[PDB]
Amino acid sequence: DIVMSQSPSSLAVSAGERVTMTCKSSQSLFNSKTRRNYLAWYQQKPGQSPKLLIYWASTRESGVPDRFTGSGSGTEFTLTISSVQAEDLAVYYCKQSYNLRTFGGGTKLEIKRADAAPTVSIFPPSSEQLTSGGASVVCFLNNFYPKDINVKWKIDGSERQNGVLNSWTDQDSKDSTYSMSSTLTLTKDEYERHNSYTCEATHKTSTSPIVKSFNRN
Amino acid sequence: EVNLVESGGGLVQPGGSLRLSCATSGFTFIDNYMSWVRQPPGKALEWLGFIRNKVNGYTTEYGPSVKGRFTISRDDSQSILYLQMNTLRTEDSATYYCVRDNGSDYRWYFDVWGAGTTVTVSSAKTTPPSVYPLAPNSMVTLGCLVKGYFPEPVTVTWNSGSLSSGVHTFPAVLQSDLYTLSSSVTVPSSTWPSETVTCNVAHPASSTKVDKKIVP
């Protein structure tokens, strides 16, 4: 029932810079008999299982780079990372094993990088989806940074705000950029009652929206 | 090497039950304490509980969230760990992990983890995806629309894994009991339609495997 709190929720850092994250427990994780603070730190990279980094608050697991140092005791612990590398992209969880086990809410470590404009691509509904009675117009906004971005759909010059579903990828493992998918779902009939289909992306990298479009015919 | 592999995770109607397994190898199972940890999509890890070894009376301890509804057990002759889940709720949807709860020298940390087994608790019916090809300048971007499937997940590749760079597979979005996702791949305009570009979609839930060649 020991409550664990982590801060910050998420932090963005650049390769080479140091980072620190805290973990607070409602009770002392220190054991008088063993003489150790039962607080461990786990690193969970994208799509992988969590991995033990540090235990007993400051002891480093075998094979874990020296730039990962844990410290603290009692109720306030800290995970510090000197010279952060891109590969360190992950969520870091602290966990107490004084009595039972409880995980902190985790700190999401994001990787900073230069701004980058999105590469926009628009795609007309596939012929097979059409024959089946469906019509999905897809628009990709790839490799941009930072994450905030806006998409506006225009059918024959008029803004469409219904039937649009967007999805954001996590930071690319290669260049740390983000990508977003925007799908306009219409019925075959609805899709044919119009001709002009436009996808407009607005990102801080430009006051001018990036426009891409096509026509049914 | 030490290996842990969870099984049993599937799609289960709310209210029903399910038993997960964790087959192990590479270490003396009978000597260890074992725990189960889970994690809802995009959420934080949660300790579910553990089971002491024979020397300690095979007793168990649980987390508040599951105590009373889940039961941890083991078979030391088989080196297998079990997790019985009863009265499933939607909040149970998650990836379940099997871990070694190393007690030696009073360490008490999770040094080995399985890859995890995913449990989806919904009333929706397992439905196969309808993979569609998306096609339109030193480079060209091609896509693939994987629509109307359930439950997660689907694994998407390009040219059987050959094409790994310039790929973006977007997280699926749930729309009326059906997931939809897309994947884009960017390649040199000189390699297409020159070289074939194929979208590979696998959906174990419905034993489905679809290949969709991208044609102009």
């Binding site: 063993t34 150790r36 004084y98 | 009073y106």
Partner: peptide, 7 residues
Amino acid sequence: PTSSEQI
């Protein structure tokens, strides 16, 4: 506390 258990 469970951290004091042996084995």
